Design a protein around this ligand. Sequence first.
Ligand SMILES: Nc1ncnc2c1ncn2[C@@H]1O[C@H](COP(=O)(O)O)[C@@H](O)[C@H]1O
Ligand SMILES: Nc1ncnc2c1ncn2[C@@H]1O[C@H](COP(=O)(O)O)[C@@H](O)[C@H]1O
Ligand SMILES: Nc1ncnc2c1ncn2[C@@H]1O[C@H](COP(=O)(O)O)[C@@H](O)[C@H]1O
Ligand SMILES: Nc1ncnc2c1ncn2[C@@H]1O[C@H](COP(=O)(O)O)[C@@H](O)[C@H]1O
Lengths: 472, 472, 472, 472
Amino acid sequence: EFEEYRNPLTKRYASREMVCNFGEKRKVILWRQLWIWLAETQKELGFDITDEQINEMKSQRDSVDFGTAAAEEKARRHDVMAHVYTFALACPKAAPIIHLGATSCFVGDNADLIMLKDGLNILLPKVARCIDRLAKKAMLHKSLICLARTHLQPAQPTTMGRRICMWIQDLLLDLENLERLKNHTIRFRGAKGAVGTQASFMDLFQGDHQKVIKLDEILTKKSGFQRSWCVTGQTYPRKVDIEITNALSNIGATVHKICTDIRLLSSFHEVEEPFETKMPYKRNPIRSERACSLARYLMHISTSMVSTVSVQWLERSLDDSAIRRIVLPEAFLAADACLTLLQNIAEGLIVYPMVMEANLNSELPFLVVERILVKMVSEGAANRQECHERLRKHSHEAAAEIKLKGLKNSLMDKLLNDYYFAPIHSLLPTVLDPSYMIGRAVEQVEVFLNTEVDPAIHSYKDCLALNSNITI
Amino acid sequence: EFEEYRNPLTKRYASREMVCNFGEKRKVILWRQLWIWLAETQKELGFDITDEQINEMKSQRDSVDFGTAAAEEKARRHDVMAHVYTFALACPKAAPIIHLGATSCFVGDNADLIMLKDGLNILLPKVARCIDRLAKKAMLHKSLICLARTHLQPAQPTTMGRRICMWIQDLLLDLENLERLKNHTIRFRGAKGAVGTQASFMDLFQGDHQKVIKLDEILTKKSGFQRSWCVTGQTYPRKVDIEITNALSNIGATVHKICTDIRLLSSFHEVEEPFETKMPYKRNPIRSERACSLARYLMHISTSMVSTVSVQWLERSLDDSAIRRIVLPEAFLAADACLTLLQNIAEGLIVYPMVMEANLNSELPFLVVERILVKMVSEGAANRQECHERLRKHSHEAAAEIKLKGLKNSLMDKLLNDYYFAPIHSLLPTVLDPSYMIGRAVEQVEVFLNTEVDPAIHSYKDCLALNSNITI
Amino acid sequence: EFEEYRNPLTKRYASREMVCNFGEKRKVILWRQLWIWLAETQKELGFDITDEQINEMKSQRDSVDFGTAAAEEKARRHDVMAHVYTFALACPKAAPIIHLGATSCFVGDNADLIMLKDGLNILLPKVARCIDRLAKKAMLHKSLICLARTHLQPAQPTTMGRRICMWIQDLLLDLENLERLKNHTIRFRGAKGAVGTQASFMDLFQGDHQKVIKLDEILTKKSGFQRSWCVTGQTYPRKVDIEITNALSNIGATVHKICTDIRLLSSFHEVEEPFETKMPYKRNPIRSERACSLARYLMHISTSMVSTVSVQWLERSLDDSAIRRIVLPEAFLAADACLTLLQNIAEGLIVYPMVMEANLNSELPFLVVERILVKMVSEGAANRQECHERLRKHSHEAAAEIKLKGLKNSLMDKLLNDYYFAPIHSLLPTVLDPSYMIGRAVEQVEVFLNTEVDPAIHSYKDCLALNSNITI
Amino acid sequence: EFEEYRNPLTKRYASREMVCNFGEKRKVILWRQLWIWLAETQKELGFDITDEQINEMKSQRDSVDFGTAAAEEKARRHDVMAHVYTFALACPKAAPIIHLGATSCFVGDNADLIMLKDGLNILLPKVARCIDRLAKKAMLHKSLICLARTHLQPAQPTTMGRRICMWIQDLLLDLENLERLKNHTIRFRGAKGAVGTQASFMDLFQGDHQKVIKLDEILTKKSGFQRSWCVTGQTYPRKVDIEITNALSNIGATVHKICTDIRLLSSFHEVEEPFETKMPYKRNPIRSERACSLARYLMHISTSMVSTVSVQWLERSLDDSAIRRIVLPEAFLAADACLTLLQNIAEGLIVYPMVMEANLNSELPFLVVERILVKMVSEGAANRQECHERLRKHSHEAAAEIKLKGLKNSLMDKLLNDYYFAPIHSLLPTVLDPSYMIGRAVEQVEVFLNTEVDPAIHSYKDCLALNSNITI
Ligand SMILES: Nc1ncnc2c1ncn2[C@@H]1O[C@H](COP(=O)(O)O)[C@@H](O)[C@H]1O
Ligand SMILES: Nc1ncnc2c1ncn2[C@@H]1O[C@H](COP(=O)(O)O)[C@@H](O)[C@H]1O
Ligand SMILES: Nc1ncnc2c1ncn2[C@@H]1O[C@H](COP(=O)(O)O)[C@@H](O)[C@H]1O
Ligand SMILES: Nc1ncnc2c1ncn2[C@@H]1O[C@H](COP(=O)(O)O)[C@@H](O)[C@H]1O
């Protein structure tokens, strides 16, 4: 168990249920469930399949002899057919009617779509929880004033909750894309035959178009889908796999930016990721870096799907089978692992207001030179061009004292001792109040959380209790 | 003009109007139009901006002195500010109120969104035309029976129009994704200020939240958008650029598969791309290969956008400006060039029914061995296992005569001279009729074209007349 | 074992020894071996480490208590430190000197480089075998004349062995790149300390530069390397990981082209991949498609490494740890799986000369029209422009009979019954001899195999016996 | 000139000579030069080509009538053939022997290889200059002590020049890879004919293998190459294009990391990029961000080349022509633009020692707790476990005063007033001297610059004078 390379997604990062969502046992159970639905539908459509045969497949659907299946696959060189005969050996009564009229893609593609849809159902509450936990921090810190940063340089002040709403906005689009995949984009393949023309099922029903349509119509309903593709080749359109990985890779870009921002702010000592207390105020963003690492892998996992779809030859070419075994589950496992890390970091995100105030104060004298300029022109009868060049000379020499000599910012005292800036000497004691410079930061948080966030996660307000633990 | 490297997208492949959609003249006109809308909105919101100033900006919006702008940019090292002062020099009356309270991203990001939206408006009718031209070929050849191919090997017969509907289904999803970008995903940035808090506009309106909201509300309306982002940083969420390139790269995967299929079938002499007659029945798929080449470049153009978005630091970092100048226009130009090639190839696609019939006939004796087996068991009282092994021995030796000795397929005469297959000797003269093996291929074309294709392109039935000429 | 998602590379495609090359047991054994070499080197450099301590680490290097290590990691949240204390508990005598003066990257990075180098040593003989098996087929079929294909259209005749040499040329460059990685590019990290300055080891040796240099010099020798990096940060330059995945992705591009070519020629019935006989002359390129699928995944696995290296912050940032656990082993496992498939397909590649002759004959009358034109001008006193237009009219109508009416090529009989082409009527009986049109195809195979292939694999002529079995 | 989209690489970022290296005029001149060399070689090999014909091609090689060529291409739909007839119209004497026996890839592929090789000759001195300028800064600041950063958190002190050597090491590998491409990997295609068998040239020389070999041997020499491929299809192995873009993309990863590091350190006010003085000590890393943006585009430009090579069908398929027109020149233009930015930033890189000392001092009391622990055990007879827990309690509460209360680090005064730490009270006044903690940082710079950098750029010591100006 330790001598072989263990993929870290399955063993170290992704959740238990997502790993089991793509296990081989889960897959063959779906294969056997589809053969059951096929026989149930064929029987109720006029075909002679006794319910004694159907209940025999039902009785031993969950007991798969993988020892026989592996031996069958080595001798038949066909994985689906190996499990056809394995299920047939376990079901002697129902053996002649198993997989009747269908091809291996009937169980292959339809069970994939079931696993892919169930994978989204696993991811969706975790995206919603990430939104919920960040939305509570954004509301909690909607007035916590801090320095905004452009080019990683100090910019005009904002609030920490206002910055968090910037992160949530991206998560709102990922949730929207994932819901669209599950509710609209992903359809059922159904029973289309070898090349999508349903010729085999047309033979079985003696050329009755209506029964063949209803067979496909019923199977789509039994498997939990709303509609099926109508003009497939042998498979469902592989462009669907692009849509899935694109949406999942899109989550990776969001998680990577959020956690890079958290890593950046951690170096300014303004925030810190949570951690197991098993030092508390002097450590590294270990979890945010891991999320960035896993998000970057997820970010690029889509590059091999697009080129795979572009070389699907005509009705079907098998050079998509192996790569889909890898990319699709690992894309879900990485997305699951990133959202697990993101919710944990969002839940226990620590902030340090006094450092935010200290960093804000040391840069504020430079950030107010323009509203001081407006004050001199509007209230001091100062010439715009003349007051600007003088403020520049004072700012230029004060900025030199900061970087060249390592001194503290004394720009405000430079203007105080300057006769020219007499009209603003009275406002200088309180000109560095960060509370009147944040514009509508607080109000934007309120409207955004109330109007855009709350309705977007409304249907998940019953799945938001589960906290995200990081044991490793 | 020939000494410098000329990007082939702008000179050789993409359409005139898409190239001009991203020209610098078009961009600065948008920049000046946004400054006009800003002044028009600020004036009607209570700010003192005389309409004499507004109409002066209107009079010389379309006349840009690029000689001054380049000189300003070299001395200011800022492209937007260079065009602020250039527009200010041309507008002495309105100079003090140009770009009032806004940052360079007010014109930078909003004009990009206008150009990106207009780029989709250029692409959408071309996608619809590609669907329309393929839909007419699919209806025209809904009964043209031909060999379907899996693993590039002969499979059960289908029809050429049924295979074309497989291509159209992918184009229906690309049209759907592009419409969703333009109608829903792409929003306006509006007037958000330096860090998205609208602090500057709050200063100008003396802290009136209502006027600041209406300023953003009116600008969103004037620029032709329905809503704006509410919690930006300095820019609109760059995840939008991922959504755009992902949808455009998705078109590349579709075009590449369609044209690879056309290239494959051209080697079997069953189809041939159109060509300028300026030999007619002996040439190379030059246009389909070019479309594949341009589609593959478009397919992967999205890989640099996702990593760019993932490293956007906090409120804004300028390492997305240069790459967006390249990737976004070239993604549109390549998509435009592929759809131009795809419509041209779809319009003049030639088919050769006699080759389709000949290729069908040479492979049909192998494709009917299973329905012959069913005939022997159902009508000849033959044992399934015993009739299967005998059909295999006849098929094995006939397949050896094909590849080893280069002879023609004589499997049907092998069964005719076999006493065992007496019950099927009467059906052997007509057992190779491809008309009863295509299942529901014809009916699937009808339903698909009537129910899914026709409504999807309904709003474009006025833009479908323009044919796609390939001069190069 | 079947309820969890099993990565198909480790379970289905890659070889046993490559899977075990990256197992966790193998890794910790390397970690313990490096701590041994560290103590052995420190002891022989003047530090007080008794050989009783060293042999205690030696006695229980191969017995790893993973139960303790997992419990230590959950409480310490550090995988290396968990195995420091686990090895320390198993080695009470040597516990105080384990990991002395080094950081976790001493075992982390150095053991990775050992595993990466050993991975290349696994791949190199398999690349050589792929070259050897293809070189034997190329020599075997150096005179087997067949149709060359451009734009997938028939071109001038070549030979099958000459086409195989085209494949081998790409494999010669992949072998060359892999040897360069192992012999030159990959260096040792050594003992550099926390930030690469060796400050800790300088403290231990009381500031003796010479002992610190020799410590790094000896460790590089003991671990089987020739040199070490001199100016690292905390890790070895991650650009090395780009070089590795680029070379491995390069193998994927080669394997994909070779096996796509085999898939294409299989549809013309001129070749066929090997297969387990457990129909023989009527089947699908199942193995070549799987190789294409795995090669395409390997082709793109490099895209996440380049962006990881580009965001390594300053001396070290941990957002490369998780993705390196995935990409580096899976890149080796996929490369190993592709070369396994490629050698198997190369060993048992079947050719069909009579189909090659038949396909050649049906297209030869079009491929000789230009040398007939030269014959008419050089020997028949024909005007070039006048003889060209007449040959075109005969070729145009013959090409129409092929595609429009499905008839056989009767161009040679069109020229025979034409009075104009009297000077070439005598050569017409034998003008379709493919043996005088292949140029230097045979001689090129001889020189290439003797001068370029044989020396390139000379050092592997003892590893070429092992055949490649595909059980699945 | 402003109405059409102008690719920013050609107009804004890349150098003049690199843009002209891929211009169409430069290409056709190479096409005409190859036809000249072909005639010169054929004439001196026994073929009847009078030097009057050869000098006529020589006289008007540089005067290309692009008006005729564009008209020829529109009517012939073939760009090479259009310039064959255009050159033929300008050369009536030599018209019958132009392009004799060769195919369009003779000029197409060989001129590409000449342009690609000349592109490397443009890049190589710029890589060397980047190394030279960084090596001078590394030597200049080999003793400038500063804080090293892991996880973007403060780590053990190093020196600025020692950190720069970390950047140079990556550039040494890119220079090494580029030299290997130009001197070894890139070969000549030569005169191989339509499918690489040289059948046409064998016809012209009446089947003389020796003259055909010498024709290819001489052309390889005349064009400035050392050897040619021997077993091509119609083109040179497109894997070469992968090797080129991989090496160029590798430069992008290096430039992106260097300039991200410069962007990070600029936010700590320890360095600052150069800038046109046309504020000086308060601005944004505009140039480093642009380099990151262009490097990221270059980083991923390789993703479309690998998939293009993987789908080259058999002897040749034309779906690589269009994408090679785009990717190969833009990869060189982006690499050229990044190295231009990198050298400019390296030349004028500003450092601020007092900020480095201030940042170092505020974090040093935490970075010395472990060597204080060693001092207490080695010199104060303190128990290791007992002295560690006490140092932790003092460090834990001091770290809380930093982040919670925003106070300054008073850990050293906490130990001074603690009776337990009496043995280290005397060393406390000077325990924060950063000069004894940097290990071998200074010596590593000396050895690295003298032994690895100086020999690597030895052949470029005549191309190092040219400074890199950034006008935009
Ligand atoms: N048309 C087909 N549809 C589904 N599976 C197939 C088809 N043809 C072959 N297979 C099987 O699919 C498996 C290929 O899986 P992979 O290892 O991913 O290539 C093998 O067991 C094949 O026998
Ligand atoms: N915050 C900003 N928003 C918009 N443009 C900016 C900003 N800061 C600098 N610029 C300008 O944007 C241009 C950068 O373009 P690029 O060449 O794509 O990097 C330069 O002219 C800069 O002066
Ligand atoms: N500087 C470092 N070098 C090596 N490993 C570290 C370092 N810092 C933390 N770690 C550990 O590395 C592991 C991260 O692995 P991953 O799950 O790939 O992020 C965790 O056990 C961390 O405690
Ligand atoms: N075998 C060939 N080798 C070189 N060029 C060709 C070949 N076949 C066609 N062409 C021409 O190459 C050009 C294709 O360029 P692109 O626009 O990049 O597809 C057209 O002018 C074609 O006529």
